[PDB]
A paper describes a structure:
The S. pyogenes Cell Envelope Proteinase (SpyCEP) is a highly conserved surface-exposed serine protease that cleaves and inactivates all ELR+ chemokines (containing the N-terminal glutamate leucine arginine motif), notably CXCL8, mediating evasion of immune system clearance strategies and systemic dissemination. The N- and C-terminal fragments are 30 and 150 kDa respectively, and both contribute residues to the catalytic triad (D151 from the N-terminal fragment, H279 and S617 from the C-terminal fragment).
The domain architecture of the SpyCEP(D151A, S617A) mutant matches that observed in the published SpyCEP structures, as expected, with nine distinct folded domains (D1–D9). SpyCEP is significantly larger than the C5a peptidase and has an additional four domains (D6:T1147-K1286; D7:K1287-K1396; D8:D1397-M1489; D9:L1490-A1578) before the linkage to the cell wall. Surprisingly, the two C-terminal domains (D8 and D9) in SpyCEP coil back on the structure and contact the protease domain, an interaction that might retain this distal protease domain proximal to the cell wall. Furthermore, three tightly bound calcium ions present within the interfacial regions of D4–D7 also appear to stabilise the overall architecture of SpyCEP. However, electron density was only observed for residues 116–1574 of the ectodomain (MW ~160 kDa) in all SpyCEP crystal structures, with residues 34–115 and 1575–1613 remaining uncharacterized. Significant structural differences exist between the two double mutants, and these localise to the PA domain and a neighbouring ß-hairpin that supports the relative positions of the PA and protease domains. This region is completely disordered in SpyCEP (H279A, S617A) as native contacts between the catalytic H279 and Q613 at the base of the ß-hairpin are removed by mutation of the histidine to alanine. In light of this, refinement of our SpyCEP structure by using the PA domain and the rest of the protein as separate search models for molecular replacement gave significant improvements in electron density maps over using the whole SpyCEP structure, and a shift in its relative position was observed compared to the published structures. In molecular dynamics the greatest mobility is observed for the PA domain.
Numbering used by the authors: 118 to 213, 273 to 459, 465 to 476, 486 to 508, 510 to 527, 539 to 1125, 1131 to 1203, 1207 to 1266, ...
Write the structure that this text describes.
């Protein structure tokens, strides 16, 4: 009578086994944290509310009051609680086939669907736990805060507090660590486990390292991408397998209805990125078979001719393009007029004649072409710190579940596999509460997981016929019946359902424990299967399939009733070492399963445990791919490097480990107003515009910089292809002579951490540039390091405790000296210009010499290029080069230009350019003197000041900041006799403080913080040779000696029997523009801005409109300067500005500009300020060094939010008393210092309120205690906090002598308690630094009583 239950998944995962025992999920609650839900769906129902946890709306209201939750609502007997956490509302339904799509709804159907009504297959669809209640937390990623981790934490805490049994979380970041995830998220998950809550999370959908590019290289075995928080020990990580059955629109051939091997005449068909089958049919067609692709079309796929040329041929001959595969048994290809592909076997019988064809509109069941195969995108292990994740597998590919408005659809992902496990966890919890009632809250989540893992069914790849890797499937495929029928689970030393062995040498030895929850003894027979990765011998890449090595018999073991037994598994793996070390030279995985079964019958008591070890040193595998310079000299190739283009082309957008720098062209006719962007260090532009890694006379490349301020090769920064997650990355400089790298001359002020360049899709980068590692040729004290041979060293660590520090050394030259131009000969007979043989002044060496003249185009020797897309202006010399002859001479074309109009240019490998204009020394070869015309030089700031007695002597820069154009505006020097405030942002306006009929000697400029009254320690000081003539030597740009920007605040700038002290405030906070007022007098509009110490004071106001010219809001004029098309409006005597109508100017074209005392500029559209009514007020909320709720005078939250000047943190409100409550903020990166609740009153007198939440920023560090020898049995290592708390440290998995943790920045002490007879020698104290790794080397010293 009632429709049949679809069992496509249920027969596979064995759900009936628990359902028959009475475990359907009644009395349980599942919290689904997802995108959206339709709580009205026919599936969202329970059979009996008498046995349910939340019996009514009143029961939930009581739960809310007791939990302190004054939001969210009960919806029905199934959806007992819902809230939208992003928007803070009860708008829980999404997307209000694509029309009804809802990820969250799909997910909810899988765990707890309970439809009474039949879907399109004629079957009703049920979830794993159909009688369970649902809690729905609507949380998702948004532009304002991408992670939304803080909202997911609050949702987790709510679910636990309101009474959930299981939580299904889709949140995730690839390559998760087990022991170093975010502190508030890991704490929230740990409080859930303590409450008896199972936390179920998808593994992710990124496959392995390089999945969007190619298979990983056999030399790079750390390719795991399993995501965080699933990589946490507490959550259950879920991998996905493809369903054996698919429900979709198929293709029917009624004559082939008698073929049960061909799904009774129904076929699966595929299309490319563009779908055009709608234009062909909806819901009969005669087809015709073709044998040749030469002169509906039924055709066999051709390996020679493309899909395009097969389709085109069918159009020319006459209906449709039904392409059938040439490979038997193969799934349909992605093909990338109407066309579609389908199976070979299906068309071997379609091919036999001519007849019927019909594309069905309604979905139908079909066996999957890729069924019982691990999903291609399912995330593999290991964990970034080397633990075995994921934990288990469940069907996630082609899952048919609930969509909006009683609809249904198919979706693929670990996100569909996750609710299978969430549902199963509800049934196992219900089973343990009945059968093990004394098992406490705090222990139940670990046992639910252990039963599901041990009773899981081990997958065998149906193609290779080999056991799927534990790193891909985990413990195996979900078996619900086994987890509720057997009373058995398997554990290792750690008390977990899987074993992570650490490093392997010649032997694998581990202890396996079987637990019996039943009243009778069980005799099990066991064997262990050993596997490794299969490598393609032709490509030297991992195939991501396994190789079975050996099966070891273990014999029989008896597991006592209500008890446990422990066995030892020993395996000598040395016999395989030679063969496998050849294939995988940097080490390889040794993994598999210990399989237990009943000694009497094969079918009963099938329980198992996955294990994984690494043969080698997992902790010391390369973090960064070898440099492009080193790869090129060995003839090797990088994983992501594009080898196309000319020989040795290293275009900077390519993906490699190397050094980058900024280029700036040298012009001869005008000044350079723009740089050329970044380029690869050691590469130079050829005649075709391509950057080539050029060689010196010795055939080696040269890495050299010229830090002289001309913006051409001034610095060198690290760029890397990261193979593994890294931490504590920094750059350091040494003398080339300092081979041991003992005396650092300069260290990057900051340290870095980040992800491996996994490149799962186009959004994930294949390489990372770290501009923070830039070396500009200055020491730690900011002194100029002299020209010479240095070593630029990039050091970093893997995310594995005990790993050795890794480093990449680059030989680098500092050379600030232009090459030598002296003499040349010129032969009037042949026009031969012969310069003196090439010589460089410095160590870099001359790379190229050239000759050019200036081509006059449009009566100018230069070209002004206007890039409207970036609103940028470029100016370039029209350089026309003369060919260099084999003997190094040049034949000057005198018809093109006169002898005196030729330039001779010499450039070194460091970026130093010498240019001589032939003709500066002009009135058979005639001798000709050459000198550089100083064309390449550091720009100099306009100094047209005269210092009078009244002046303080303090100088600064001034520049008009742009609204439209992106060119660096003209800046000039100005006096600072008032408003001693600076904005160190290098925009040309008040960026620094400097000192200018007198004479000064021993000039000494020093800067000290506010409280340094005794002048004890300067933060910055001037460099040896400071003069009143050169303002650069005394200019302080709001930085430390190490080059870091000083924090906002006041400072002592003191010039030195004379000592001139001056207090300078630093602030780059943009001014906050208020709405002002608008009035219409005699038809003409009027704008009256609001009248305004602390650097927020306004020094100048502007009102203007941007007059559009030549399709742009900016103009370029020949001095060459770039300007905005600003038409100014004068201030009226009362204080207003007349916004008089102009023939083509609107209010959105008008602006109000303000400059503060610090030189920070803000501007706003007049139409934006006008959006606030004459009666309304504005409030702004911010953090100073998130989600908020505003309530009216009554206490009712505000509705119909009105946003001011395009800010989601600025609200337009009527007058009245209000309250603001800070609800969430990232507790991981920030700490709140002020009140969460703020009262503010908006009125006519106070029509603009600023409300700030004072926050302190948080940083992390890594501490590792590394010992001499292994610590004796009984030793405890912990870290002592400044607040007297002890953090227990555990022996690292890969480095047993090391103990470490990722901690918040602060002071710590390594505490060690040893048995009698030992002492620890060495420092235990550490003052940790941001993103830094602190290694503590300690000695275990034997001791005796005196
Ligand atoms: Ca330079
Ligand atoms: Ca040089
Ligand atoms: Ca500035």
């Amino acid at each position: 009578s009632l429709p049949p239950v679809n069992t496509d998944v249920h027969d596979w995962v064995k759900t009936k086994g628990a359902w028959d025992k009475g475990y359907k999920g009644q009395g349980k609650v599942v919290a689904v944290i997802a995108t959206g839900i339709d709580p009205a769906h026919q599936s969202m129902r329970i059979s009996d509310v008498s046995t349910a946890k939340v019996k009514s709306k009143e029961d939930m209201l009581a739960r809310q009051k007791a939990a302190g939750i004054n939001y969210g609502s009960w919806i029905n007997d199934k959806v007992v609680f819902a809230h939208n956490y992003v928007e803070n509302s009860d708008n829980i339904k999404e997307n209000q086939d694509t029309k009804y799509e809802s990820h969250g709804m799909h997910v909810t159907g899988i765990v707890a669907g309970n439809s009474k009504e039949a879907a399109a297959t004629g079957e009703r669809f049920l979830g794993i736990a159909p009688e369970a209640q649902v809690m729905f937390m609507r949380v998702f990623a948004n532009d304002i805060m991408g992670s939304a981790e803080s909202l997911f934490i609050k949702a987790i805490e709510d679910a636990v507090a309101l009474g959930a049994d299981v939580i299904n979380l889709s949140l995730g970041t690839a390559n998760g660590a087990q022991l170093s995830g975010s502190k508030p998220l890991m704490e929230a998950i740990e409080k859930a486990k303590k409450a008896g809550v199972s936390v179920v999370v998808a593994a992710g959908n990124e496959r392995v390292y390089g999945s969007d590019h190619d298979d990983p290289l056999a030399t790079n075995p750390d390719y795991g991408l399993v995501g965080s928080p699933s990589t946490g020990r507490t959550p259950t990580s879920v991998a996905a397998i493809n369903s054996k059955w698919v429900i979709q629109r198929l293709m029917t051939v009624k004559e082939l209805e008698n073929r049960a091997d061909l799904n009774h005449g129904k076929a699966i068909y595929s299309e490319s990125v563009d779908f055009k089958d709608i234009k062909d049919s909806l819901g009969q067609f005669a087809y015709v078979k073709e044998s040749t692709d030469a002169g509906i079309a039924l055709i066999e796929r051709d390996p020679n001719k493309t899909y395009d040329e097969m389709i085109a041929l069918a159009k020319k001959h006459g209906l449709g393009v039904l392409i059938f595969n040439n490979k038997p048994g193969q799934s349909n290809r992605s093909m990338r007029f109407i066309s579609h592909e389908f199976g070979k076997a299906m068309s071997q019988l379609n091919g036999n004649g001519t007849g019927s064809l019909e594309f069905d509109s309604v979905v139908s069941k079909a066996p999957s072409q890729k069924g019982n195969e691990m999903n291609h995108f399912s995330n593999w292990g290991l964990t970034s710190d080397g633990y075995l994740k994921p934990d288990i597998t469940a069907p996630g590919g082609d899952i048919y579940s609930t969509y909006n408005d009683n609809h249904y659809g198919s979706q693929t992902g670990t996100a569909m596999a996750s609710p299978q496990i969430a549902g199963a966890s509800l049934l196992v919890k219900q089973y343990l509460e009945k059968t093990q009632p004394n098992l406490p809250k705090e222990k139940i989540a670990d046992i639910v997981k252990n039963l599901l893992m041990s009773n899981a069914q081990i997958h065998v790849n149906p193609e290779t016929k080999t056991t799927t890797s534990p790193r891909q499937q985990g413990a195996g495929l979900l078996n619900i019946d086994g987890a509720v029928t057997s009373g058995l689970y398997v554990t290792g030393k750690d008390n977990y359902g899987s074993i992570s062995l650490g490093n392997i040498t010649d032997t694998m030895t581990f202890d396996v424990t079987v637990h019996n929850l039943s009243n009778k003894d069980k005799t099990l027979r066991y064997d262990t299967e050993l596997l490794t990765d299969h490598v393609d011998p032709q490509k030297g890449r991992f195939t991501l399939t396994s190789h079975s090595l050996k099966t070891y018999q273990g014999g029989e073991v008896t597991v006592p009733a209500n008890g446990k037994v422990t066995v030892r598994v020993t395996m000598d793996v040395s016999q395989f070492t030679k063969e496998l070390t050849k294939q995988m030279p940097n080490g390889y995985y040794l993994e598999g399963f210990v399989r237990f079964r009943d000694s009497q019958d094969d079918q009963l008591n099938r329980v198992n445990i996955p294990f994984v070890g690494f043969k080698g040193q997992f902790e010391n595998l390369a973090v960064a791919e070898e440099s492009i310079y080193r790869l090129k000299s060995q003839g090797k190739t990088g994983f992501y490097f594009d080898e196309s283009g000319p020989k040795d082309d290293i275009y900077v957008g390519k993906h490699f480990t190397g050094l980058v720098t900024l280029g700036s062209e040298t012009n001869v006719s005008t000044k350079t107003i723009s740089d050329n962007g970044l380029h690869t260090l050691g590469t130079f532009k050829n005649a075709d515009g391509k950057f080539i890694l050029e060689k010196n006379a010795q055939g080696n490349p040269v890495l050299a910089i010229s830090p002289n301020g001309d913006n051409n090769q001034d610095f060198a920064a690290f760029k890397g292809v990261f193979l593994r997650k890294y931490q504590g990355l920094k750059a350091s400089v040494y003398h080339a002579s300092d081979k041991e790298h003992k005396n650092p001359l300069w260290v990057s002020p900051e340290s870095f951490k980040g992800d491996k360049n996994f490149n799962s899709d186009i959004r994930f980068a294949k390489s990372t540039t770290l501009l923070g590692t830039a070396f500009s040729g200055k020491s730690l004290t900011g002194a100029e390091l002299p020209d010479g041979h240095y070593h630029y060293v990039v050091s970093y660590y893997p995310d594995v405790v005990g790993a050795k520090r890794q480093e990449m050394t680059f030989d680098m030259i500092l050379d600030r000296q232009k090459p030598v131009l002296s003499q040349a000969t010129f032969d009037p007979e042949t026009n031969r210009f012969k310069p003196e043989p090439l010589k460089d002044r410095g160590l870099a060496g001359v790379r190229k010499d050239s000759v050019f003249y200036l081509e006059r185009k449009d009566n100018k020797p230069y070209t002004v290029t206007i890039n409207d897309s970036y609103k940028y202006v470029s100016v370039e010399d029209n350089k026309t080069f003369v060919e260099r002859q084999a003997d190094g001479s040049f034949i000057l074309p005198l018809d093109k230009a006169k002898l005196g109009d030729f330039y001779y240019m010499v450039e070194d490998f460091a970026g130093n350019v010498a240019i001589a204009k032939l003709g500066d020394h002009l009135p058979t070869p005639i001798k000709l003197k050459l000198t550089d015309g100083n064309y390449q030089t550091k720009e100099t700031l306009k100094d047209n000041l005269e210092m009078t007695q009244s002046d303080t002597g303090l100088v600064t820069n001034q520049a008009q900041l742009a609204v439209v154009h992106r060119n660096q505006p003209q800046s000039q020097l100005t006096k600072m006799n008032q408003d001693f405030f600076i904005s160190p942002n290098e925009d040309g306006n008040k960026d620094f403080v400097a000192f200018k009929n007198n004479v000064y000697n021993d000039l000494t400029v020093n800067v000290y913080a506010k409280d340094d009254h005794q002048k004890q320690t300067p933060i910055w000081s001037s460099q040896a040779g400071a003069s009143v003539s050169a303002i650069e030597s005394t200019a302080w740009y709001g930085i430390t000696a190490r080059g870091s920007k000083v924090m906002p605040g006041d400072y002592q700038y003191v010039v030195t029997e004379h000592q001139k002290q001056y207090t300078i405030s630093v602030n780059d906070k943009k001014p906050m523009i208020t709405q002002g007022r608008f009035d219409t007098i005699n038809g003409v509009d009027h704008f009256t801005p609001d009248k305004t110490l602390d650097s927020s004071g306004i020094v100048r106001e502007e009102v203007f409109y941007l007059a559009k010219k030549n399709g742009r809001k900016f103009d370029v004029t020949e001095g060459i300067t770039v300007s905005d098309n600003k038409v100014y409006i004068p201030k009226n005597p009362d204080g207003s500005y007349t916004i008089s109508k102009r023939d083509g100017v609107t209010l959105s074209d008008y602006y109000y500009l303000v400059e503060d005392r610090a030189g920070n500029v803000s501007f706003a559209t007049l139409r934006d300020l006008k959006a606030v009514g004459k009666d309304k007020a504005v409030v702004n909320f911010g953090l100073d060094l998130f989600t908020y709720l505003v309530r009216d005078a009554d206490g009712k939250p505000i509705e119909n939010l009105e946003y001011y000047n395009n800010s989601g943190n600025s609200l337009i409100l009527p007058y009245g008393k209000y309250t603001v409550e800070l609800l969430t903020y990232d507790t991981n990166a920030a700490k709140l210092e002020s009140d969460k609740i703020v009262s503010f009153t908006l009125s006519a007198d106070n029509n603009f309120q600023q409300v700030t939440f004072k926050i302190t920023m948080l940083a992390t560090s890594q501490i590792t205690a590394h010992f001499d020898h292994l610590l004796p049995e009984g030793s405890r290592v912990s870290l002592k906090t400044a607040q007297d708390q002890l953090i227990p440290l555990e022996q690292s998995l890969y480095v047993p002598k090391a103990y470490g943790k990722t901690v918040q920045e602060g002071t710590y002490e390594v505490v060690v308690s040893l048995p009698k007879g030992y002492r620890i020698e060495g420092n235990t104290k550490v003052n940790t630094l941001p993103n830094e790794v602190h290694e503590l080397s300690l000695r275990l010293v034997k001791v005796g009583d005196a």
